[PDB]
Amino acid sequence: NFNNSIKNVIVFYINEKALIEEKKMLSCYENKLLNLIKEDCENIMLKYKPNLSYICSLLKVDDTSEENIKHIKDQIIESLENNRPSVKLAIISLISMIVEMNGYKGKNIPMSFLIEDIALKISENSEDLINFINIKN
Amino acid sequence: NFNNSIKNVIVFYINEKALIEEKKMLSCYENKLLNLIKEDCENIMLKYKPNLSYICSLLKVDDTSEENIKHIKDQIIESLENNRPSVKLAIISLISMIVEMNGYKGKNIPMSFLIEDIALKISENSEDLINFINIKN
Amino acid sequence: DMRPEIWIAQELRRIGDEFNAY
Amino acid sequence: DMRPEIWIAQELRRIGDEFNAY
Ligand code: NA
Ligand code: NA
């Protein structure tokens, strides 16, 4: 006697509230970087939707399992280890496109571990990247 | 040489993108229930911020650990087992207030297990609840 | 340690009451 | 199974190139 509609409304409702609280943790500096990265990763997504889908295809992104998501992480990190700003903005877009594709399957734990560990490796030697997004204007 | 700002911008950026994809999974029916529940749980939050904080105090919500968050879940479920619509809308608000308080500490796994398992128990016998929110107008 | 358990269910019972009339 | 690994890094190398000029 469980209502499919209510459960998923309550879950989404709380998560939405949890995102807002993560947003207030972003500061003037981080809020602007966000908006600047937003614009870059969006423009990448139109032209390289053709190109990024092919990567989403090579990496079997429908596998939705740690055994594979762990491999997706390793492979993405391997590409960074072999790391200029342009590639970094492209990795972010790739992940956004993995989210777009697997967003209906729901939130799963491995992806979070992936999003954090990749977000982490990208932060390495941020200096070269900060310049890229801030020579826009 | 890790940049604190970039990591947390990328993580938030992807999560925000992951929330939008969960939103498109909500249908006309669920989208309206959401908005209706939103309004009720908000009005509860102003008057019973005095009252809901006391519950947030009794339950040590700063414990942020499974050993305690598991107890918070058990206790909230026990209150439902002992379940009219009004209480349900109040449990949702309580959780939203736990999120408001612990939203800066970051997303942790136990709370998700709590939000889902409580959202699940609330869905039980939805019939009596649907009426409550839809006799608004 | 049961006293904290009682007051939480007791305090939720009031919120639902006030909220059933309005 | 290494061929899929190569093309992914190869395909990312193009996106960064095109994106460095503009
Ligand atoms: Na979040
Ligand atoms: Na989400």
PDB file of N, CA and C in Angstrom, chain A residues 12-111:
ATOM      1  N   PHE A  12      12.889  13.886  -3.265  1.00  0.00           N
ATOM      2  CA  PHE A  12      13.344  15.026  -4.049  1.00  0.00           C
ATOM      3  C   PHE A  12      13.256  16.311  -3.242  1.00  0.00           C
ATOM      4  N   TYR A  13      12.142  16.505  -2.535  1.00  0.00           N
ATOM      5  CA  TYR A  13      11.950  17.729  -1.768  1.00  0.00           C
ATOM      6  C   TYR A  13      13.106  17.969  -0.801  1.00  0.00           C
ATOM      7  N   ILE A  14      13.488  16.940  -0.038  1.00  0.00           N
ATOM      8  CA  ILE A  14      14.564  17.102   0.936  1.00  0.00           C
ATOM      9  C   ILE A  14      15.893  17.341   0.230  1.00  0.00           C
ATOM     10  N   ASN A  15      16.188  16.562  -0.817  1.00  0.00           N
ATOM     11  CA  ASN A  15      17.439  16.747  -1.552  1.00  0.00           C
ATOM     12  C   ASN A  15      17.557  18.173  -2.078  1.00  0.00           C
ATOM     13  N   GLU A  16      16.511  18.664  -2.745  1.00  0.00           N
ATOM     14  CA  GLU A  16      16.493  20.057  -3.181  1.00  0.00           C
ATOM     15  C   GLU A  16      16.842  20.989  -2.030  1.00  0.00           C
ATOM     16  N   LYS A  17      16.278  20.737  -0.846  1.00  0.00           N
ATOM     17  CA  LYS A  17      16.614  21.552   0.315  1.00  0.00           C
ATOM     18  C   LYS A  17      18.068  21.361   0.725  1.00  0.00           C
ATOM     19  N   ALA A  18      18.617  20.161   0.519  1.00  0.00           N
ATOM     20  CA  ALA A  18      20.007  19.907   0.880  1.00  0.00           C
ATOM     21  C   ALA A  18      20.967  20.567  -0.096  1.00  0.00           C
ATOM     22  N   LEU A  19      20.558  20.718  -1.358  1.00  0.00           N
ATOM     23  CA  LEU A  19      21.404  21.394  -2.331  1.00  0.00           C
ATOM     24  C   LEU A  19      21.526  22.876  -2.007  1.00  0.00           C
ATOM     25  N   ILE A  20      20.411  23.515  -1.653  1.00  0.00           N
ATOM     26  CA  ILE A  20      20.440  24.933  -1.305  1.00  0.00           C
ATOM     27  C   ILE A  20      21.436  25.189  -0.182  1.00  0.00           C
ATOM     28  N   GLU A  21      21.520  24.271   0.783  1.00  0.00           N
ATOM     29  CA  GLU A  21      22.436  24.475   1.898  1.00  0.00           C
ATOM     30  C   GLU A  21      23.885  24.288   1.473  1.00  0.00           C
ATOM     31  N   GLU A  22      24.138  23.453   0.461  1.00  0.00           N
ATOM     32  CA  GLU A  22      25.476  23.376  -0.115  1.00  0.00           C
ATOM     33  C   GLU A  22      25.807  24.631  -0.910  1.00  0.00           C
ATOM     34  N   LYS A  23      24.793  25.266  -1.498  1.00  0.00           N
ATOM     35  CA  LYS A  23      25.009  26.478  -2.281  1.00  0.00           C
ATOM     36  C   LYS A  23      25.447  27.640  -1.394  1.00  0.00           C
ATOM     37  N   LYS A  24      24.811  27.802  -0.232  1.00  0.00           N
ATOM     38  CA  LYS A  24      25.205  28.863   0.685  1.00  0.00           C
ATOM     39  C   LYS A  24      26.619  28.671   1.209  1.00  0.00           C
ATOM     40  N   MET A  25      27.194  27.480   1.051  1.00  0.00           N
ATOM     41  CA  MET A  25      28.585  27.271   1.425  1.00  0.00           C
ATOM     42  C   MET A  25      29.558  27.769   0.364  1.00  0.00           C
ATOM     43  N   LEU A  26      29.079  28.074  -0.839  1.00  0.00           N
ATOM     44  CA  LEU A  26      29.927  28.647  -1.873  1.00  0.00           C
ATOM     45  C   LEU A  26      30.040  30.153  -1.668  1.00  0.00           C
ATOM     46  N   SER A  27      31.268  30.660  -1.706  1.00  0.00           N
ATOM     47  CA  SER A  27      31.559  32.056  -1.417  1.00  0.00           C
ATOM     48  C   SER A  27      31.661  32.872  -2.703  1.00  0.00           C
ATOM     49  N   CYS A  28      31.725  34.198  -2.534  1.00  0.00           N
ATOM     50  CA  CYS A  28      31.846  35.114  -3.666  1.00  0.00           C
ATOM     51  C   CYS A  28      32.822  34.584  -4.706  1.00  0.00           C
ATOM     52  N   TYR A  29      34.014  34.189  -4.259  1.00  0.00           N
ATOM     53  CA  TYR A  29      35.005  33.633  -5.172  1.00  0.00           C
ATOM     54  C   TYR A  29      34.468  32.383  -5.856  1.00  0.00           C
ATOM     55  N   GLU A  30      34.008  31.412  -5.063  1.00  0.00           N
ATOM     56  CA  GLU A  30      33.542  30.145  -5.618  1.00  0.00           C
ATOM     57  C   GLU A  30      32.255  30.313  -6.414  1.00  0.00           C
ATOM     58  N   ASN A  31      31.385  31.239  -6.006  1.00  0.00           N
ATOM     59  CA  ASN A  31      30.155  31.464  -6.755  1.00  0.00           C
ATOM     60  C   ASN A  31      30.441  31.965  -8.164  1.00  0.00           C
ATOM     61  N   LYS A  32      31.480  32.785  -8.341  1.00  0.00           N
ATOM     62  CA  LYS A  32      31.777  33.305  -9.671  1.00  0.00           C
ATOM     63  C   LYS A  32      32.488  32.261 -10.523  1.00  0.00           C
ATOM     64  N   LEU A  33      33.488  31.581  -9.955  1.00  0.00           N
ATOM     65  CA  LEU A  33      34.102  30.451 -10.644  1.00  0.00           C
ATOM     66  C   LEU A  33      33.032  29.498 -11.167  1.00  0.00           C
ATOM     67  N   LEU A  34      32.059  29.161 -10.316  1.00  0.00           N
ATOM     68  CA  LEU A  34      30.943  28.313 -10.719  1.00  0.00           C
ATOM     69  C   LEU A  34      30.276  28.840 -11.983  1.00  0.00           C
ATOM     70  N   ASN A  35      29.845  30.102 -11.950  1.00  0.00           N
ATOM     71  CA  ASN A  35      29.150  30.676 -13.097  1.00  0.00           C
ATOM     72  C   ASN A  35      30.041  30.685 -14.335  1.00  0.00           C
ATOM     73  N   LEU A  36      31.328  30.997 -14.164  1.00  0.00           N
ATOM     74  CA  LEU A  36      32.245  31.000 -15.300  1.00  0.00           C
ATOM     75  C   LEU A  36      32.448  29.590 -15.843  1.00  0.00           C
ATOM     76  N   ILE A  37      32.683  28.620 -14.956  1.00  0.00           N
ATOM     77  CA  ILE A  37      32.801  27.231 -15.392  1.00  0.00           C
ATOM     78  C   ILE A  37      31.498  26.765 -16.028  1.00  0.00           C
ATOM     79  N   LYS A  38      30.361  27.184 -15.468  1.00  0.00           N
ATOM     80  CA  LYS A  38      29.069  26.843 -16.055  1.00  0.00           C
ATOM     81  C   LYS A  38      29.042  27.202 -17.535  1.00  0.00           C
ATOM     82  N   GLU A  39      29.383  28.451 -17.861  1.00  0.00           N
ATOM     83  CA  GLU A  39      29.284  28.909 -19.243  1.00  0.00           C
ATOM     84  C   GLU A  39      30.226  28.131 -20.153  1.00  0.00           C
ATOM     85  N   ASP A  40      31.467  27.914 -19.713  1.00  0.00           N
ATOM     86  CA  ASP A  40      32.419  27.173 -20.534  1.00  0.00           C
ATOM     87  C   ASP A  40      31.939  25.746 -20.778  1.00  0.00           C
ATOM     88  N   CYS A  41      31.601  25.021 -19.707  1.00  0.00           N
ATOM     89  CA  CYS A  41      31.169  23.634 -19.849  1.00  0.00           C
ATOM     90  C   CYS A  41      29.878  23.501 -20.647  1.00  0.00           C
ATOM     91  N   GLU A  42      29.049  24.545 -20.689  1.00  0.00           N
ATOM     92  CA  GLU A  42      27.849  24.504 -21.520  1.00  0.00           C
ATOM     93  C   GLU A  42      28.203  24.631 -22.997  1.00  0.00           C
ATOM     94  N   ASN A  43      29.018  25.631 -23.345  1.00  0.00           N
ATOM     95  CA  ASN A  43      29.416  25.812 -24.737  1.00  0.00           C
ATOM     96  C   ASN A  43      30.132  24.576 -25.269  1.00  0.00           C
ATOM     97  N   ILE A  44      30.956  23.938 -24.431  1.00  0.00           N
ATOM     98  CA  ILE A  44      31.583  22.676 -24.810  1.00  0.00           C
ATOM     99  C   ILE A  44      30.527  21.638 -25.152  1.00  0.00           C
ATOM    100  N   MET A  45      29.374  21.695 -24.485  1.00  0.00           N
ATOM    101  CA  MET A  45      28.421  20.596 -24.559  1.00  0.00           C
ATOM    102  C   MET A  45      27.679  20.571 -25.887  1.00  0.00           C
ATOM    103  N   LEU A  46      27.479  21.725 -26.525  1.00  0.00           N
ATOM    104  CA  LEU A  46      26.761  21.739 -27.796  1.00  0.00           C
ATOM    105  C   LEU A  46      27.639  21.223 -28.926  1.00  0.00           C
ATOM    106  N   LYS A  47      28.823  21.818 -29.081  1.00  0.00           N
ATOM    107  CA  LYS A  47      29.701  21.444 -30.179  1.00  0.00           C
ATOM    108  C   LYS A  47      30.204  20.021 -30.010  1.00  0.00           C
ATOM    109  N   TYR A  48      30.537  19.649 -28.779  1.00  0.00           N
ATOM    110  CA  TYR A  48      31.131  18.359 -28.486  1.00  0.00           C
ATOM    111  C   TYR A  48      30.137  17.391 -27.853  1.00  0.00           C
ATOM    112  N   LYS A  49      28.837  17.678 -27.936  1.00  0.00           N
ATOM    113  CA  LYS A  49      27.859  16.605 -27.770  1.00  0.00           C
ATOM    114  C   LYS A  49      28.136  15.486 -28.762  1.00  0.00           C
ATOM    115  N   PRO A  50      28.268  15.749 -30.064  1.00  0.00           N
ATOM    116  CA  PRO A  50      28.799  14.733 -30.982  1.00  0.00           C
ATOM    117  C   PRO A  50      30.034  14.030 -30.440  1.00  0.00           C
ATOM    118  N   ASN A  51      30.995  14.803 -29.926  1.00  0.00           N
ATOM    119  CA  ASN A  51      32.276  14.228 -29.522  1.00  0.00           C
ATOM    120  C   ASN A  51      32.193  13.568 -28.148  1.00  0.00           C
ATOM    121  N   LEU A  52      31.473  14.185 -27.206  1.00  0.00           N
ATOM    122  CA  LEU A  52      31.408  13.655 -25.846  1.00  0.00           C
ATOM    123  C   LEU A  52      30.553  12.397 -25.765  1.00  0.00           C
ATOM    124  N   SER A  53      29.529  12.277 -26.616  1.00  0.00           N
ATOM    125  CA  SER A  53      28.743  11.047 -26.636  1.00  0.00           C
ATOM    126  C   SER A  53      29.620   9.856 -26.996  1.00  0.00           C
ATOM    127  N   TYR A  54      30.516  10.029 -27.969  1.00  0.00           N
ATOM    128  CA  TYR A  54      31.416   8.944 -28.350  1.00  0.00           C
ATOM    129  C   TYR A  54      32.237   8.469 -27.157  1.00  0.00           C
ATOM    130  N   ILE A  55      32.678   9.401 -26.309  1.00  0.00           N
ATOM    131  CA  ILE A  55      33.375   9.015 -25.088  1.00  0.00           C
ATOM    132  C   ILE A  55      32.422   8.289 -24.149  1.00  0.00           C
ATOM    133  N   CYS A  56      31.208   8.825 -23.979  1.00  0.00           N
ATOM    134  CA  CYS A  56      30.187   8.139 -23.196  1.00  0.00           C
ATOM    135  C   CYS A  56      29.876   6.760 -23.753  1.00  0.00           C
ATOM    136  N   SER A  57      30.142   6.521 -25.034  1.00  0.00           N
ATOM    137  CA  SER A  57      29.898   5.211 -25.623  1.00  0.00           C
ATOM    138  C   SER A  57      31.056   4.255 -25.365  1.00  0.00           C
ATOM    139  N   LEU A  58      32.283   4.692 -25.649  1.00  0.00           N
ATOM    140  CA  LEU A  58      33.463   3.890 -25.355  1.00  0.00           C
ATOM    141  C   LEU A  58      33.418   3.426 -23.904  1.00  0.00           C
ATOM    142  N   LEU A  59      33.506   4.360 -22.957  1.00  0.00           N
ATOM    143  CA  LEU A  59      33.154   4.042 -21.580  1.00  0.00           C
ATOM    144  C   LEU A  59      31.712   3.561 -21.590  1.00  0.00           C
ATOM    145  N   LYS A  60      31.469   2.299 -21.247  1.00  0.00           N
ATOM    146  CA  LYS A  60      30.093   1.836 -21.128  1.00  0.00           C
ATOM    147  C   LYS A  60      29.418   2.514 -19.941  1.00  0.00           C
ATOM    148  N   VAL A  61      28.804   3.682 -20.169  1.00  0.00           N
ATOM    149  CA  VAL A  61      28.240   4.467 -19.070  1.00  0.00           C
ATOM    150  C   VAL A  61      26.910   3.920 -18.582  1.00  0.00           C
ATOM    151  N   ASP A  62      26.290   3.009 -19.331  1.00  0.00           N
ATOM    152  CA  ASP A  62      25.060   2.365 -18.892  1.00  0.00           C
ATOM    153  C   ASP A  62      25.310   1.271 -17.862  1.00  0.00           C
ATOM    154  N   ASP A  63      26.574   0.992 -17.530  1.00  0.00           N
ATOM    155  CA  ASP A  63      26.884  -0.114 -16.633  1.00  0.00           C
ATOM    156  C   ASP A  63      26.494   0.209 -15.196  1.00  0.00           C
ATOM    157  N   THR A  64      26.460   1.492 -14.839  1.00  0.00           N
ATOM    158  CA  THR A  64      25.848   1.982 -13.599  1.00  0.00           C
ATOM    159  C   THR A  64      26.298   1.203 -12.362  1.00  0.00           C
ATOM    160  N   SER A  65      27.414   0.484 -12.434  1.00  0.00           N
ATOM    161  CA  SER A  65      27.871  -0.339 -11.325  1.00  0.00           C
ATOM    162  C   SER A  65      29.283   0.062 -10.926  1.00  0.00           C
ATOM    163  N   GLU A  66      29.605  -0.124  -9.643  1.00  0.00           N
ATOM    164  CA  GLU A  66      30.930   0.248  -9.157  1.00  0.00           C
ATOM    165  C   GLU A  66      32.022  -0.437  -9.966  1.00  0.00           C
ATOM    166  N   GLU A  67      31.890  -1.749 -10.192  1.00  0.00           N
ATOM    167  CA  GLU A  67      32.915  -2.471 -10.942  1.00  0.00           C
ATOM    168  C   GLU A  67      33.262  -1.741 -12.232  1.00  0.00           C
ATOM    169  N   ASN A  68      32.271  -1.107 -12.858  1.00  0.00           N
ATOM    170  CA  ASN A  68      32.503  -0.327 -14.066  1.00  0.00           C
ATOM    171  C   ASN A  68      32.753   1.142 -13.750  1.00  0.00           C
ATOM    172  N   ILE A  69      31.956   1.729 -12.856  1.00  0.00           N
ATOM    173  CA  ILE A  69      32.156   3.128 -12.488  1.00  0.00           C
ATOM    174  C   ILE A  69      33.542   3.336 -11.892  1.00  0.00           C
ATOM    175  N   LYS A  70      34.067   2.337 -11.180  1.00  0.00           N
ATOM    176  CA  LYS A  70      35.452   2.418 -10.730  1.00  0.00           C
ATOM    177  C   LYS A  70      36.398   2.465 -11.921  1.00  0.00           C
ATOM    178  N   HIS A  71      36.072   1.730 -12.986  1.00  0.00           N
ATOM    179  CA  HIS A  71      36.891   1.765 -14.192  1.00  0.00           C
ATOM    180  C   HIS A  71      36.751   3.100 -14.910  1.00  0.00           C
ATOM    181  N   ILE A  72      35.539   3.656 -14.940  1.00  0.00           N
ATOM    182  CA  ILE A  72      35.341   4.971 -15.541  1.00  0.00           C
ATOM    183  C   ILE A  72      36.185   6.011 -14.820  1.00  0.00           C
ATOM    184  N   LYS A  73      36.227   5.943 -13.489  1.00  0.00           N
ATOM    185  CA  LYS A  73      37.049   6.870 -12.719  1.00  0.00           C
ATOM    186  C   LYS A  73      38.528   6.701 -13.055  1.00  0.00           C
ATOM    187  N   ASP A  74      39.037   5.470 -12.961  1.00  0.00           N
ATOM    188  CA  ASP A  74      40.433   5.206 -13.292  1.00  0.00           C
ATOM    189  C   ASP A  74      40.782   5.749 -14.668  1.00  0.00           C
ATOM    190  N   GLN A  75      39.926   5.487 -15.655  1.00  0.00           N
ATOM    191  CA  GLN A  75      40.221   5.912 -17.018  1.00  0.00           C
ATOM    192  C   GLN A  75      40.216   7.429 -17.136  1.00  0.00           C
ATOM    193  N   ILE A  76      39.265   8.095 -16.479  1.00  0.00           N
ATOM    194  CA  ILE A  76      39.231   9.552 -16.528  1.00  0.00           C
ATOM    195  C   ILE A  76      40.443  10.136 -15.812  1.00  0.00           C
ATOM    196  N   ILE A  77      40.826   9.559 -14.670  1.00  0.00           N
ATOM    197  CA  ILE A  77      42.019  10.033 -13.972  1.00  0.00           C
ATOM    198  C   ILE A  77      43.258   9.793 -14.823  1.00  0.00           C
ATOM    199  N   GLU A  78      43.334   8.631 -15.477  1.00  0.00           N
ATOM    200  CA  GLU A  78      44.467   8.339 -16.349  1.00  0.00           C
ATOM    201  C   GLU A  78      44.597   9.382 -17.451  1.00  0.00           C
ATOM    202  N   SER A  79      43.470   9.836 -18.004  1.00  0.00           N
ATOM    203  CA  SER A  79      43.516  10.874 -19.028  1.00  0.00           C
ATOM    204  C   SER A  79      44.032  12.191 -18.458  1.00  0.00           C
ATOM    205  N   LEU A  80      43.641  12.528 -17.227  1.00  0.00           N
ATOM    206  CA  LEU A  80      44.160  13.738 -16.596  1.00  0.00           C
ATOM    207  C   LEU A  80      45.657  13.622 -16.341  1.00  0.00           C
ATOM    208  N   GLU A  81      46.103  12.475 -15.825  1.00  0.00           N
ATOM    209  CA  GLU A  81      47.525  12.297 -15.550  1.00  0.00           C
ATOM    210  C   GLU A  81      48.344  12.422 -16.825  1.00  0.00           C
ATOM    211  N   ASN A  82      47.793  11.974 -17.947  1.00  0.00           N
ATOM    212  CA  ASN A  82      48.443  12.142 -19.238  1.00  0.00           C
ATOM    213  C   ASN A  82      47.854  13.337 -19.982  1.00  0.00           C
ATOM    214  N   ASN A  83      46.377  17.165 -19.065  1.00  0.00           N
ATOM    215  CA  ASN A  83      45.860  17.825 -17.869  1.00  0.00           C
ATOM    216  C   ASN A  83      45.767  19.344 -18.044  1.00  0.00           C
ATOM    217  N   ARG A  84      45.968  19.825 -19.269  1.00  0.00           N
ATOM    218  CA  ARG A  84      45.834  21.247 -19.527  1.00  0.00           C
ATOM    219  C   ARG A  84      44.402  21.694 -19.241  1.00  0.00           C
ATOM    220  N   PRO A  85      44.193  22.993 -19.004  1.00  0.00           N
ATOM    221  CA  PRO A  85      42.837  23.465 -18.669  1.00  0.00           C
ATOM    222  C   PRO A  85      41.755  23.013 -19.636  1.00  0.00           C
ATOM    223  N   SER A  86      42.012  23.049 -20.945  1.00  0.00           N
ATOM    224  CA  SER A  86      40.975  22.695 -21.912  1.00  0.00           C
ATOM    225  C   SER A  86      40.424  21.299 -21.642  1.00  0.00           C
ATOM    226  N   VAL A  87      41.311  20.316 -21.467  1.00  0.00           N
ATOM    227  CA  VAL A  87      40.862  18.956 -21.178  1.00  0.00           C
ATOM    228  C   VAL A  87      40.024  18.937 -19.907  1.00  0.00           C
ATOM    229  N   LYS A  88      40.459  19.669 -18.878  1.00  0.00           N
ATOM    230  CA  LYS A  88      39.740  19.674 -17.608  1.00  0.00           C
ATOM    231  C   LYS A  88      38.294  20.111 -17.798  1.00  0.00           C
ATOM    232  N   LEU A  89      38.086  21.266 -18.432  1.00  0.00           N
ATOM    233  CA  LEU A  89      36.727  21.709 -18.717  1.00  0.00           C
ATOM    234  C   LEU A  89      35.966  20.664 -19.519  1.00  0.00           C
ATOM    235  N   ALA A  90      36.672  19.871 -20.325  1.00  0.00           N
ATOM    236  CA  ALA A  90      36.014  18.822 -21.094  1.00  0.00           C
ATOM    237  C   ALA A  90      35.644  17.632 -20.213  1.00  0.00           C
ATOM    238  N   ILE A  91      36.479  17.297 -19.222  1.00  0.00           N
ATOM    239  CA  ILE A  91      36.127  16.214 -18.307  1.00  0.00           C
ATOM    240  C   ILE A  91      34.863  16.573 -17.538  1.00  0.00           C
ATOM    241  N   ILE A  92      34.778  17.817 -17.053  1.00  0.00           N
ATOM    242  CA  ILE A  92      33.582  18.256 -16.336  1.00  0.00           C
ATOM    243  C   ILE A  92      32.347  18.063 -17.206  1.00  0.00           C
ATOM    244  N   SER A  93      32.420  18.517 -18.456  1.00  0.00           N
ATOM    245  CA  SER A  93      31.291  18.360 -19.363  1.00  0.00           C
ATOM    246  C   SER A  93      30.945  16.888 -19.549  1.00  0.00           C
ATOM    247  N   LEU A  94      31.959  16.048 -19.776  1.00  0.00           N
ATOM    248  CA  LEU A  94      31.721  14.615 -19.906  1.00  0.00           C
ATOM    249  C   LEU A  94      30.895  14.097 -18.737  1.00  0.00           C
ATOM    250  N   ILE A  95      31.323  14.402 -17.513  1.00  0.00           N
ATOM    251  CA  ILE A  95      30.593  13.947 -16.333  1.00  0.00           C
ATOM    252  C   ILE A  95      29.175  14.509 -16.332  1.00  0.00           C
ATOM    253  N   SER A  96      29.023  15.785 -16.682  1.00  0.00           N
ATOM    254  CA  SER A  96      27.675  16.330 -16.783  1.00  0.00           C
ATOM    255  C   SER A  96      26.847  15.536 -17.785  1.00  0.00           C
ATOM    256  N   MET A  97      27.469  15.078 -18.874  1.00  0.00           N
ATOM    257  CA  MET A  97      26.726  14.300 -19.860  1.00  0.00           C
ATOM    258  C   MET A  97      26.444  12.883 -19.372  1.00  0.00           C
ATOM    259  N   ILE A  98      27.334  12.314 -18.557  1.00  0.00           N
ATOM    260  CA  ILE A  98      27.029  11.045 -17.904  1.00  0.00           C
ATOM    261  C   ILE A  98      25.851  11.219 -16.958  1.00  0.00           C
ATOM    262  N   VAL A  99      25.803  12.354 -16.257  1.00  0.00           N
ATOM    263  CA  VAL A  99      24.689  12.637 -15.357  1.00  0.00           C
ATOM    264  C   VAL A  99      23.401  12.789 -16.155  1.00  0.00           C
ATOM    265  N   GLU A 100      23.457  13.541 -17.257  1.00  0.00           N
ATOM    266  CA  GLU A 100      22.278  13.704 -18.102  1.00  0.00           C
ATOM    267  C   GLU A 100      21.727  12.356 -18.550  1.00  0.00           C
ATOM    268  N   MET A 101      22.607  11.427 -18.921  1.00  0.00           N
ATOM    269  CA  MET A 101      22.157  10.141 -19.437  1.00  0.00           C
ATOM    270  C   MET A 101      21.632   9.249 -18.318  1.00  0.00           C
ATOM    271  N   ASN A 102      22.389   9.119 -17.231  1.00  0.00           N
ATOM    272  CA  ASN A 102      22.024   8.241 -16.127  1.00  0.00           C
ATOM    273  C   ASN A 102      21.280   8.966 -15.008  1.00  0.00           C
ATOM    274  N   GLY A 103      20.733  10.153 -15.279  1.00  0.00           N
ATOM    275  CA  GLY A 103      20.044  10.908 -14.246  1.00  0.00           C
ATOM    276  C   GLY A 103      18.701  10.330 -13.850  1.00  0.00           C
ATOM    277  N   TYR A 104      18.075   9.547 -14.733  1.00  0.00           N
ATOM    278  CA  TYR A 104      16.782   8.946 -14.422  1.00  0.00           C
ATOM    279  C   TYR A 104      16.928   7.695 -13.567  1.00  0.00           C
ATOM    280  N   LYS A 105      18.063   6.998 -13.672  1.00  0.00           N
ATOM    281  CA  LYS A 105      18.270   5.795 -12.875  1.00  0.00           C
ATOM    282  C   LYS A 105      18.365   6.106 -11.386  1.00  0.00           C
ATOM    283  N   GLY A 106      18.579   7.364 -11.027  1.00  0.00           N
ATOM    284  CA  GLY A 106      18.644   7.772  -9.638  1.00  0.00           C
ATOM    285  C   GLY A 106      20.070   8.002  -9.170  1.00  0.00           C
ATOM    286  N   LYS A 107      20.161   8.607  -7.989  1.00  0.00           N
ATOM    287  CA  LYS A 107      21.448   8.862  -7.361  1.00  0.00           C
ATOM    288  C   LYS A 107      22.017   7.565  -6.798  1.00  0.00           C
ATOM    289  N   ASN A 108      23.259   7.247  -7.166  1.00  0.00           N
ATOM    290  CA  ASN A 108      23.949   6.071  -6.651  1.00  0.00           C
ATOM    291  C   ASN A 108      25.275   6.490  -6.029  1.00  0.00           C
ATOM    292  N   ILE A 109      25.768   5.653  -5.119  1.00  0.00           N
ATOM    293  CA  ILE A 109      26.910   6.005  -4.275  1.00  0.00           C
ATOM    294  C   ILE A 109      28.196   6.052  -5.091  1.00  0.00           C
ATOM    295  N   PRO A 110      28.515   5.033  -5.898  1.00  0.00           N
ATOM    296  CA  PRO A 110      29.785   5.081  -6.650  1.00  0.00           C
ATOM    297  C   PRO A 110      30.004   6.378  -7.421  1.00  0.00           C
ATOM    298  N   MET A 111      29.011   6.834  -8.192  1.00  0.00           N
ATOM    299  CA  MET A 111      29.178   8.071  -8.950  1.00  0.00           C
ATOM    300  C   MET A 111      29.645   9.210  -8.056  1.00  0.00           C
TER     301      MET A 111
END
